[PDB]
């Protein structure tokens, strides 16, 4: 039918995958057992007596998270060798997960991906969730893109990378893994959506007003974002937009596919019932600069293209009316050479809220994925961090001893600089 | 999975590490007869990291005990949790190295190192794939410093890619028995820098200083010092035994704390630490824990961390907590204490969370940090070494056993280069 | 005669069913002795199964489910190791779905009542008391023995404690789960438990 | 098994009352400082949000970890909402079903859906005290 394959690599990949495969189970009304009491085909297969199994693969070189999914509540939902675990972790080293210990479980990963893509044709594309700052999220992810682009050359690849924040990073080895993975996902990843952890910390602290959130509070928000991107495939709507729909509408140039994200409304229990969630209001709250999900101020950027995914009791006139106000608002600048840069993808189904969560039932919602020239600053931060550390070869001998030469550090430096120059010259 | 082989040598290494197995078995719920009690799965799902099934259901530690005299081996066996160990894993001497590194390493320790290499080959090869080794010993003495470091040199030749971290008790600052102390220390240090991936330093006057202000113990015996060491000792492997939101094993820690290969000497701290009286009057929150473990008087080395710069450091949090407030606070320490850190490394600090806090608490953190303030240690041992080496004092017990004069100069050349290498980075 | 012929339970089965056949033949070209398929027994009588805090649960509530006997001991370290895995398995498996699928009936090999209550205080599934002679006739039927002390009629020790045996309606073993058996897969043999096919009808 | 306090005595609850509304159980214990902290706050919140309107919107079933009939009757004598019966097996069934360790766990509100399985978890052993209203009583109403 219209199937997509979600690949989860690394601890952030697995733990984001727990939230999205909780939400998709609840949305299509299937149980943790796997059977419900054909719109679910985009995310679930069929196995005999009504069991629907997810079209996902779990990859992590370290047992302590994938094994603990097997023992947890969702035992029988996932197929037993759709969850692949190694023996020793990559341990925050890109060279380990790419050369020495990565290669052992790559062939196991491709075997399950091959067996899951050959079930039916009409494969719509691949999704991948990974941590750039981690070891196997960068290491095993780069190998897995390289050996998927050669085989399934035609298909789209949508990446959702948990990029390290400017202030908080929880690693000194993360500037190395960030700039070494950017040379990976320039020429293999089709469209990359840029995620930042403490941006979501700030969203869940002033919008929904949790003072002390955690990783299972951010991952629900990511799950609602992914559900909004793929809502159009699953359910019927006024204007359907696939995953092939996104590459032709957001990236104008081959090397420029780095884009932000936004959700509205991120609203709590008390706030939601007391407020009109107008179609004008949720769009205005989406374009608010701090309400983006990347910690990247867009006022010092130019919007190249922008897609709006509406979800709920949304009529098309209010969409047309609200977005005209946005364009005539003076604060946000649009690039001169792109006169039309907005999408209306309107879907009928309201967002299904996980009970015990933190969001409320809202009648309508909007999720924005915008390609902007504000990505220059978020690379300039990681570039300056890499220049300080590599000035005196700190933490380099760990990389050299595992097989990576000295010189991939050199060449990935101007590759990021070549990316940085392109975003400067496109803003002319 | 992975198993940490525990190799235990000398009087200190047995005595502080026998009560290491007091604490690990308590957390994992092991009856001293080896059976399990405690009716939960989280302990027992990852127990082969430190134990072995013994076809009768009992869990034996994968631990090896070394000494050149049978005195402290009798005492470890005779205490509580003495029957846990396998009697075969004991390896005994009959003579004993009288505070002499030469007869610990060259002469008398050679006839025993073949037997203890045999037992470490049996219980490291028989597993699936080991992660590394954990060696616990002292430096002032003979059997721990000498014959322990011989095993480090032997195993590093045999297994050249497994991690090798050491819970080493360095010499004392001020009050010291074993008058030939810096000879054994300096010789062990220059052999530690070539074979040990991580070294974690412990001082006794550090531990005496902890239990005089914080824990308020008037009469601290040697048992409670080991209980304090074994508390931060078991915290290094929280990520291995229990699941957590952000895991960090030993190889995680090595790549994250060691910028340059020769400098791998760390600094251990643990929090919280309160007296029994003021146990119930405190607010155990991550502001309070982080202030507790960034304090000079909470470390387990009596060398001032305000007199140097933290190159890199890591905190491994235990307990159900908030990942935002552990991330903001661990950046809150860097924003004020910028003059205490180094500038060419952005965000010196590491966060990792284990969901199972230690027993009887609800939140804990262990701090291990690569600080250049540790150079006050190696200067202190070097100038004591230099004073005792110009006069050629006490050399005749070392030259007599079959050790040459030249490696004494070599050891001093190594630590002066180790001191100078730390001095470049301040 | 499944899985054994020399069982006390099978002897009792054959006596009652063949007595029924004789009485029917006397009342009325009927097969004497009766076929083993046509022999029927009631396995757990009304006073056998007791749930948590001692309330009688009849055999009627075991219908349409996968039922396994847990032959267990108190001080056996293998039993103490296997217990938390089976607790987690039971809890997760029963939460995973609208209806509850598996049940465990506990057969004790403990020394005395204090050990019985101390061990059974953990367990949430059903348990057969130590004094009821069912706890020894089922033991002899499914060939469980801590040590070779029972007069055993040319059997082999099919299992040692701990063991779980999936039972059928008429006492036939649905499947052996190999913890201490020919496969020797401890605490991971529980995943081999299939529950479509081994329904207690 | 579930009782309601009226003027003078106790009455068994009507199962038709729990429908059309939202349901939370309150795991607590008499004699605890945090339970004495939290009980009157939830009391005033309950009476405000249930008498500010025509129809009731929430109800609370109180479950106790007390070891004494005297303390159980003591808290039931002044707590306005529902309660469970002390000797009924449902109290221990709810404990082992919902994992309260019997401290840093009490008090607790577990909001429950219609099929007996939870719709929310909420604790008070934390700095924030404005968390009572973070539970939506309009997405999750029983049929």
């Amino acid at each position: 039918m219209r199937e997509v394959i979600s690949i989860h690599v690394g601890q952030a990949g697995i733990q984001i995958g727990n939230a999205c495969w909780e939400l998709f189970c609840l949305e299509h009304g299937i149980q943790p057992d796997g059977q419900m009491p054909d719109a679910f085909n985009t995310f679930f297969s069929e196995t005999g007596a009504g069991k629907h199994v997810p079209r996902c693969v779990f990859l992590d070189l370290e047992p302590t998270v994938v094994d603990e999914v097997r023992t947890g509540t969702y035992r029988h939902l996932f197929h037993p060798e759709q969850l692949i675990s190694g023996k020793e972790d990559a341990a925050n080293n890109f060279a380990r997960g790419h050369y020495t210990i990565g290669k052992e479980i790559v062939d196991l990963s491709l075997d399950r991906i091959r067996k899951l893509a050959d079930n039916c044709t009409g494969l719509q594309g691949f999704l991948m969730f990974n941590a750039v700052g981690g070891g196997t999220g960068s290491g095993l992810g780069c190998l897995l893109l390289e050996r998927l682009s050669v085989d399934y050359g035609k298909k789209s690849k949508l990446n959702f990378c948990s990029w390290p924040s400017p202030q908080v990073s929880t690693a000194v080895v993360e500037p190395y893994n960030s700039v070494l993975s950017t040379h990976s996902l320039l020429e293999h990843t089709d469209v990359a959506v840029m995620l930042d952890n403490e941006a979501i910390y700030d969203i869940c602290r002033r919008n929904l007003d949790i003072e002390r959130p955690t990783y299972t509070n951010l991952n629900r928000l990511i799950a609602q974002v992914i559900s909004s991107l793929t809502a159009s495939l699953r359910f019927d709507g006024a204007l359907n937009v696939d995953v092939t729909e996104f590459q032709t509408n957001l990236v104008p140039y081959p090397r420029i596919h780095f884009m932000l994200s936004s959700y509205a409304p991120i609203i709590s229990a008390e706030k939601a019932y007391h407020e009109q969630l107008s179609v004008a209001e949720i769009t205005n709250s989406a374009f608010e600069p701090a309400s983006m999900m990347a910690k990247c101020d867009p006022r010092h950027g130019k919007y190249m293209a922008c897609c709006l995914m509406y979800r709920g009791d949304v009529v098309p006139k209010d969409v047309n009316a609200a977005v005209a106000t946005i364009k005539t608002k003076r604060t946000i600048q649009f690039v001169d050479w792109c006169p039309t840069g907005f999408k209306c993808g309107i879907n009928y189904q309201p967002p299904t809220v996980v009970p015990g969560g933190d969001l409320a039932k809202v009648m309508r919602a909007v999720c924005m994925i915008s390609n902007s020239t504000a990505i220059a600053e978020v690379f300039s931060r990681m570039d300056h961090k890499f220049d300080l550390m590599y000035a005196k070869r700190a933490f380099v001998h760990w990389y050299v001893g595992e097989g990576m030469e000295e010189g991939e550090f050199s060449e990935a430096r101007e590759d990021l600089a070549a990316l940085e120059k392109d975003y400067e010259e496109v803003g002319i | 999975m992975r198993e940490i082989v525990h190799v235990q040598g000398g009087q200190c290494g047995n005595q502080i590490g026998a009560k290491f197995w007091e604490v690990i078995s308590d957390e994992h719920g092991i009856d001293p007869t080896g059976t399990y009690c405690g009716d939960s799965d989280l302990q027992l799902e990852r127990i082969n990291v430190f134990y072995n099934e013994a076809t009768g259901g009992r869990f034996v530690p994968r631990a090896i005990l070394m000494d050149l005299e049978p005195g402290t081996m009798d005492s470890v066996r005779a205490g509580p949790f003495g029957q846990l160990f396998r009697p075969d894993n004991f390896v005994f001497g009959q003579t004993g190295a009288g505070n002499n590194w030469a007869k610990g390493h060259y002469t008398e320790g050679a006839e025993l190192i073949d037997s203890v290499l045999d037992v470490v080959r049996k219980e490291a090869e028989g597993c699936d794939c080991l992660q590394g080794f954990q060696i616990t010993h002292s430096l002032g003495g003979g059997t721990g410093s000498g014959m322990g470091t011989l095993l480090i040199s032997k195993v590093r030749e045999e297994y050249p890619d497994r991690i090798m971290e050491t819970f080493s008790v360095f010499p004392s600052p001020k009050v010291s028995d074993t008058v030939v102390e810096p000879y054994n220390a300096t010789l062990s240090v220059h052999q530690l820098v070539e074979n040990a991936d991580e070294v974690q330093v412990i001082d006794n006057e550090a531990l005496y200083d902890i239990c005089f202000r914080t824990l308020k113990l008037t009469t601290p015996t040697y048992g409670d010092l080991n209980h304090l060491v074994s508390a931060a000792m078991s915290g290094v492997t929280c990520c291995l035994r229990f699941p957590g939101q952000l895991n960090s094993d030993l190889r995680k820690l090595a790549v994250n704390l060691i910028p340059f290969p020769r400098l791998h000497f760390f600094l251990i701290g643990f929090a919280p630490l309160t007296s029994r009286g003021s146990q119930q009057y405190r607010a155990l929150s991550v502001p309070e824990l982080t202030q507790q473990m960034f304090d000079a008087k909470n470390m387990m080395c009596a060398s001032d961390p305000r007199h140097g710069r933290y190159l890199t450091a890591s905190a491994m949090f235990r307990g159900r907590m908030s990942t935002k407030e552990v991330d903001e606070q661990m950046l809150n320490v860097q924003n004020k204490n910028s003059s205490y850190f180094v500038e060419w490394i952005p965000n010196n600090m590491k966060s990792s969370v284990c969901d199972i806090p230690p027993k009887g608490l609800k939140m804990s953190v262990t701090f291990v940090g690569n600080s250049t303030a540790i150079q006050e240690m190696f200067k202190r041992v070097s100038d004591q070494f230099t004073a005792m080496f110009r006069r050629k004092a006490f050399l005749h017990w070392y030259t007599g056993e079959g050790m040459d004069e030249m490696e004494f100069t070599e050891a001093e050349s190594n630590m002066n280069d180790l001191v100078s290498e730390y001095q470049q980075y301040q | 005669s499944q899985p054994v012929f020399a069982s006390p339970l099978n002897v009792e089965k054959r006596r009652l069913n063949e007595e029924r056949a004789l009485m029917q033949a006397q009342k009325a070209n009927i097969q004497l002795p009766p076929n083993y398929g046509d022999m029927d027994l009631i396995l757990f009588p009304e006073g056998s199964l007791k749930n948590s805090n001692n309330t009688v649960i009849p055999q009627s509530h075991l219908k349409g489910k996968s039922v396994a006997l847990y032959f267990a001991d108190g001080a056996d370290p293998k039993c103490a190791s296997l217990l938390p895995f089976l607790l987690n398995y039971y809890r997760t498996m029963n939460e995973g779905g609208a209806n509850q699928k598996i049940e465990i009936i506990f057969v004790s090999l403990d020394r005395d009542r204090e050990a019985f209550e101390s061990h059974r205080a953990h367990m949430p599934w059903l348990s057969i008391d130590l004094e009821n002679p069912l706890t020894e006739i089922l033991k002899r039927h499914f060939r469980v023995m801590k040590e070779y002390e029972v007069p055993t009629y040319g059997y082999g020790s099919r299992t040692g404690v701990p063991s779980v045996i999936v039972i059928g309606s008429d006492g036939r073993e649905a499947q052996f789960l190999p913890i201490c058996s020919g496969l020797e897969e401890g605490d991971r043999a529980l995943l081999r438990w299939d529950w479509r096919n081994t329904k207690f009808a | 098994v579930v009782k309601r306090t009226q003027q003078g005595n106790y009455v068994p609850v009507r199962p038709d009352h729990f429908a059309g509304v939202s349901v939370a159980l309150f795991f607590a214990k008499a004699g605890h400082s945090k339970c004495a902290q939290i009980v009157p706050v939830v009391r005033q919140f309950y009476k405000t949000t249930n008498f500010s309107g025509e129809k009731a919107v929430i109800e609370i079933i109180y479950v106790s970890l007390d070891k004494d009939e005297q303390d159980f009757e003591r808290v039931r004598a002044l707590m306005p909402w529902c309660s469970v019966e002390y000797k009924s097996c449902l109290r221990k069934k709810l404990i082992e079903r919902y994992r309260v360790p019997n401290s840093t766990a009490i008090p607790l509100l577990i909001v429950i859906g219609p099929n007996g399985e939870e719709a929310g978890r909420m604790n008070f052993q934390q700095s924030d005290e404005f968390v009572l209203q973070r539970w939506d009583y309009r997405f999750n109403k029983w049929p």
């Binding site: 299972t216 | 806090p357 | - | 399985e117």
Partner: peptide
């Protein structure tokens, strides 16, 4: 003189069964 065990993993606490919408 031991103590009982009162800690559960974060996955086991936040990822349980969940009531389906009608």
């Amino acid at each position: 003189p031991t103590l009982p065990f009162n800690a559960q993993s974060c996955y086991r606490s936040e990822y349980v069964a969940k009531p389906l919408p009608p």
